[PDB]
Amino acid sequence: REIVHIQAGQCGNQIGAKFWEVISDEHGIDPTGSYHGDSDLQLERINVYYNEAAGNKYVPRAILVDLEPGTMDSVRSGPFGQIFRPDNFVFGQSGAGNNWAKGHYTEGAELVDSVLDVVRKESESCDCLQGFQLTHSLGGGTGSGMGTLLISKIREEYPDRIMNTFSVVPSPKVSDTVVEPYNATLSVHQLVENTDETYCIDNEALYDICFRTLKLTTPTYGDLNHLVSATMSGVTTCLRFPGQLNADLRKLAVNMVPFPRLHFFMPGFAPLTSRGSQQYRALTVPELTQQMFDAKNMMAACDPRHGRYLTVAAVFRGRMSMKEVDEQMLNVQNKNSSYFVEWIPNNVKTAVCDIPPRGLKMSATFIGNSTAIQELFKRISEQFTAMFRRKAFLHWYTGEGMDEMEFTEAESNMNDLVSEYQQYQD
Amino acid sequence: REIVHIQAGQCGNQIGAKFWEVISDEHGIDPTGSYHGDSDLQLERINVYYNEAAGNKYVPRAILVDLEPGTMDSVRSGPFGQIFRPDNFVFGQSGAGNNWAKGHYTEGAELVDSVLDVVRKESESCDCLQGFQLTHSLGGGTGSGMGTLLISKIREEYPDRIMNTFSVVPSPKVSDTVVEPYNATLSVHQLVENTDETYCIDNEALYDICFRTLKLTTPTYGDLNHLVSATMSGVTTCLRFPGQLNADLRKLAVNMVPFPRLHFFMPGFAPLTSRGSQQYRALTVPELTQQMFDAKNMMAACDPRHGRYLTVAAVFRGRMSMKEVDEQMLNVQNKNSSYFVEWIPNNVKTAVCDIPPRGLKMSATFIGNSTAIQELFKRISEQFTAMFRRKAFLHWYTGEGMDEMEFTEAESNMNDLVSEYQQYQD
Amino acid sequence: RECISIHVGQAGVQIGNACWELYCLEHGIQPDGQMPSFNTFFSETGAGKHVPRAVFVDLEPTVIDEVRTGTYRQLFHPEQLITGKEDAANNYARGHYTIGKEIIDLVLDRIRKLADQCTGLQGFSVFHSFGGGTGSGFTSLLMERLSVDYGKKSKLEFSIYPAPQVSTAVVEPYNSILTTHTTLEHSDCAFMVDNEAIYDICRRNLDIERPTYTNLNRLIGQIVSSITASLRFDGALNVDLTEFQTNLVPYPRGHFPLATYAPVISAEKAYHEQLSVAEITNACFEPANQMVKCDPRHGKYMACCLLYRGDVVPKDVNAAIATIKTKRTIQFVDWCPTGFKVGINYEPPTVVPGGDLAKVQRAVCMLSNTTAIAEAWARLDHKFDLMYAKRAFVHWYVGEGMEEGEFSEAREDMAALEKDYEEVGVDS
Amino acid sequence: RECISIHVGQAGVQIGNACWELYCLEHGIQPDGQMPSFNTFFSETGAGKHVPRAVFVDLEPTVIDEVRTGTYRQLFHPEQLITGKEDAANNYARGHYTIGKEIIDLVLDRIRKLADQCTGLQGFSVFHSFGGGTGSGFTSLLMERLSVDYGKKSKLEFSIYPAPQVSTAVVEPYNSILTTHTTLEHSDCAFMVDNEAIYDICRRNLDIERPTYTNLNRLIGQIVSSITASLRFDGALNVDLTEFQTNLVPYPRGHFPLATYAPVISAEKAYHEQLSVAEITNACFEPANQMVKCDPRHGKYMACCLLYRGDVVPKDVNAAIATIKTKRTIQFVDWCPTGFKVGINYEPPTVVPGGDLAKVQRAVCMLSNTTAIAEAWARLDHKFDLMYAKRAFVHWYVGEGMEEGEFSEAREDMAALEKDYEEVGVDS
């Protein structure tokens, strides 16, 4: 029944800053820590993410990890940085510098032991864990590097808990680190087989949505990470709150994974349009389904109609009829039958929660597992190869002891995921 | 039913300065000597540590001993130095200079007769003594040197009373006297077989705790000796006040000593964390047990998980359920079964008092007897040997007549304690 | 999270003067150190005075004396101000060896003292010039020791690139060739700028036909502050110095990223003109704002880092990047995908009161590693060769213990470096 | 809890002048003895005048007359001011024997009078110089008697270490060699400092190129006060003089702990710089603040004592110790574990009005016994040897009854002492 969340890397720490904000919004918990809500449900299932400390203080069940105090400090300095206890800030001193080898292989490795100890302390604080969630970037040093290391140890300690992670996937246009594909390649090599599932977030796609449908001209990462948190929070609240359908994360995982190795997801979100049009929108189930199916409302820079859909999850929040939902999902399946895989009859699955997100009447979360995902892997693998041949920045990595044959195997493994998507693309 | 306490050495005198302060806090006794409390219990069992003198004056049943008036004077000059009667200040003139030989063997020996006379006067003032307690440093001249001499005579007079002592154990990093291990070695040679039990306090560990969990950047010895007094006062109050379990010091001694010679203890204390986190802490029995088990909350620079645990005492103060305590102790035993000794079934014992320490809702005192203790002896013995071969400062000691073969036997005896811990380490 | 600045030689120190002046301007630091308000660079006293963690080295008293008599003399700790009595004479042989080697131990101990004052030394950077005696001679000497003691710390160097047309030092080729030999192998990254190119910037973008070094160093200071003050300040993407190294150095040789900075605009030029992030970055890929006289279009890019100040929205940056990747003629080496580091600070760009540059609301600094740098080496190759073939001025080094073979060797090391650029140019 | 200071010779007395001036500064003692407020050193009169328990000996009227005509002439009791008419002439033969032996009985009786004034004599200390006639001659004579009468009291000596380069006394080696012979065997511990080393401290840390003895003795006074005033004042760890002996003397030979003191900082150097306990102790292990010209890195440590004034938290001290034990290059002799005495007084460090040292909030004194001292003896060995081989100046001792064999013997005793250092150096 409970979940532990660990954030890492500057990305992960800033995403989590919005995530937790939202969760407390959902439950009426004040930036200082106490509960000042107003709904029974708000406290009722609070356990999944909060420990109530003496005084009616709620402690977010999460660990903030970094290798630079300053980022942690900036998190702590805002509202909701006060709700986190000092003991959840685990950090070192001297960066990682966006270096996998430092993060995973060497220096960051050193910190992980202290992180894990706190993890253990929290695992004991829970009655019964459902699982763990981690937030991070695929091409980052602590985000992926150190984060991955941690994941391998947590999974080891808890094989029976859900291990998932959401991660920022290097967008085709904006890479920061020259070896960002290298770090990503290494994380695939480690993560894929050490996780139950991973979500693919593309900032470029997010920037398109924010202007494309939301028509906004000023977003920052906090605004885009709001959208990220909308999908993350969407998933777990249902599990928390009363609904109609089947509201268990593990069951979601079961329904979305047809094969042990292909567990990559494309998140999307509805409704998600500018205020101008809000006066011209109608709120129906087909309306949400139109926004959910549309590739432009995906947060991943993929194109599901290019690939084939293996699995689709449609999560609904708010009062909807069962009939309408059933029929519209069927219609989707029918009309987009050319994209769905024939091996899975009725490949579109649903989940229904009766609690709407604060401020909306209804909402829906799109989760997909298509073959289209392989295109991201292909882009990375290719870029990787070029760098691999030149050893760009690999003296930094090999200087910290990372061996090229390990990287070679990592490359293969990327290619293996692509070939397996092809194996089920048919 | 009553206890007599004797403080010696600059250390012992300053520790006692805090100890007695706390005891009077516990009972609402003013720095000037009269009782101004407000609870029935506060006077009810006051007898164990105070004599009520005419006028509703309470006299602490303790003797302050030193060989320099100035330290005694500084003690006397503060609050609670006025509560002690002049007759409890027994001191000479001219130091000891941190010299065992002077303290024990020669000069300090001279003073001991006057000390003992006062001891006798107090033993008569009591109705029925439970025991005696002494506070001192293991590497000090009057602390250990003269103090030990006194102990051998008190034990002689009262075989049937509890003889215990708390002592500052030379920390690995901060020795003051070059022959501090020598003095300590000699005190083992004398003390171990002339005491029922001794507690091992490491200042280094204490300085780590004060910054590690308490996050303090200004402590002095008075702040660290506060922590010491917390453990000392923790033990005797239960004996004094109503509880649930078994609140007798002798019974504690019985439960903690499996073998005539291995009676060394590792004190620890909970709760013991900074105010920041106090807003994020929950107060439960498992919470206290987490702090109690954790080696970092030990006041001794040992590591109980390195050695094996022979005996564990868990003393609780405040209202707790019996069930919860029983279950959590069991859990500890279960989860840390790899550290406990298999010869003793259910090696974790408890004691429960219903009176919380002033200002807290609950608290717990950790007392352990592990094999890990031997590591301290090993460090000393080794250092000793080197000095022994060179006779460093032994002209001061041999100049006062201390013979090297006595020291030789002392060395053996240290090694004997280590071998016996090995004999029961298995 | 701390770092050390090292100012060697006049060029190093006078640039430093501008740099520390700017840091004072960044926080309102008074000449006496009183700051009413960046402790990554500064060390605090109980008076609230902060000391810039830096070392000033000059083997001739004069420049340090200039510091000692100026306003910032109260700011700097007397031990930070280290001076010898005699000069290197434009000559590595004395700078690195004969003269500078005598004082360096003191210098190092002051550095070590500051290293002990640091709690989390991230690293350091050294300001100097490729042609001078202390500017390059002594400098490499220092690196020889610092790379031992601080082997894992950032070793970033900043140096003035010898102008192809004007140089006051006849044996500058020789000095620079010797430094190549010794710095390549020890340093992590060396950045450089060309005062001649800068003059062109001053006259075209600032409209100033009278630049002095005190102008020129203000502009340099701007660039440096973007990567030193603003990287410690808050932003969206807070990039560290170690991160810089980890994002700018692709090979274990050195590499030499060159600076480009846009906006560099006079107050009047700022009027009537609206810059966007994208427009500023367009300017960043123009030869016209290239701080080194070397043609960006000649070579191929290997690395590129863009660092943003003030009013920058990642949204706009992303669009800008898309166009620089696809619109421009920027050829790039195969090896590299276009992972250009984007640092985005909210910290606004700052301007020196009484300076030439206009108040801007946003700003972009660009670092880039282009293959055209080999041409810069080619320049040095021939200049060195000419002198060395005649053996002109050789006695000024030989008399200090230098070896002719050594000089040949150093040239060859440069040739090897050029060859490695050739290699990179070959795409693969 | 009382003690006696003994000032023999100019060096002893002039240092004493600074010492008693400092004690007056410690409590606000007026020149006439009126104190409005440390009775371990002073004896009280019904007027509230306190008399410093000390004896001043000079065999030449002049220096004592200097006292007698100065401000502190009212402070000192006329019987404390003992003077002869003629000098020792730089010569043990007269200082210890021919001349000084005549007056010593008086001197001793004044000492005994004060010993009778003491109620709890803890001990005493003697201030002198290793080279002079009364400075070392008479001094050892005194020890010969004091060690009988006060055999169980502290016998700490403080002496000026003969500068290797400048000495005004041509037969100083001879004097010092004779003292070795007689002091080693009688005294408990002798401390020493080198005025040459001190000059270097004055010029580098105080920035003074004009030190006189009146400056030099202020610095000495600082060190002495740390161990004399502040050890009687309150602290965390109140360390006594007997404790000092019990914590500093490892063997029954002598031993000779050397002084080191940090902070020694000019007022301007104090500005812009924040010392911590740890930073001050870092300075204490630097050769640069070593008060004797003898290289700490040469030898191995045997003893070390650190005494703290003012704002010192044991917490910080502990951390500092950890780093000096592990970070430094301090080699130490096997025999010893690192039990370094930590004295921690709350009593703040004091500064002489009109002095050179900056007001500090905390301070650390270091005593240390290093094997490098044998080199100091080696210096004396050859200096003695040279003279003795030629028999230069020998008639100035022989005519007073000295024996040549005796001189050889004394050298041999020194050689034995060096050999024992050799022994200690051999680790075991």
Ligand SMILES: Nc1nc2c(ncn2[C@@H]2O[C@H](COP(=O)(O)OP(=O)(O)OP(=O)(O)O)[C@@H](O)[C@H]2O)c(=O)[nH]1
């Ligand atoms: N940008 C800039 N360049 C400078 C400045 N001062 C000097 N330079 C350049 O740096 C080189 C001059 O070095 P010098 O001043 O001769 O020598 P140095 O490196 O200080 O050391 P020495 O030769 O021993 O005096 C020339 O190429 C100058 O154009 C300055 O303040 N700013």
Ligand SMILES: Nc1nc2c(ncn2[C@@H]2O[C@H](COP(=O)(O)OP(=O)(O)OP(=O)(O)O)[C@@H](O)[C@H]2O)c(=O)[nH]1
């Ligand atoms: N630190 C310090 N050293 C001094 C002082 N006065 C003298 N000395 C040193 O002590 C030695 C001088 O001893 P003298 O003054 O010649 O003789 P004396 O020991 O007073 O006794 P006589 O030879 O009989 O006059 C030299 O090594 C001086 O450098 C002083 O005030 N302070």
Ligand SMILES: Nc1nc2c(ncn2[C@@H]2O[C@H](COP(=O)(O)OP(=O)(O)O)[C@@H](O)[C@H]2O)c(=O)[nH]1
């Ligand atoms: N959505 C999103 N991406 C971020 C944020 N911060 C950094 N990123 C992305 O993360 C990558 C850089 O890795 P970074 O987080 O700096 O690595 P690390 O900090 O060394 O672990 C780039 O692709 C950025 O676009 C953020 O707050 N939100």
Ligand SMILES: Nc1nc2c(ncn2[C@@H]2O[C@H](COP(=O)(O)OP(=O)(O)O)[C@@H](O)[C@H]2O)c(=O)[nH]1
């Ligand atoms: N916790 C603690 N230790 C002390 C105190 N005073 C001295 N010590 C320790 O005691 C040892 C020194 O012995 P000391 O007490 O001076 O001996 P004595 O006074 O001659 O009997 C050192 O290891 C100190 O750390 C104190 O007030 N508290």
Ligand SMILES: [Mg+2]
């Ligand atoms: Mg110059």
Ligand SMILES: [Mg+2]
């Ligand atoms: Mg004289």
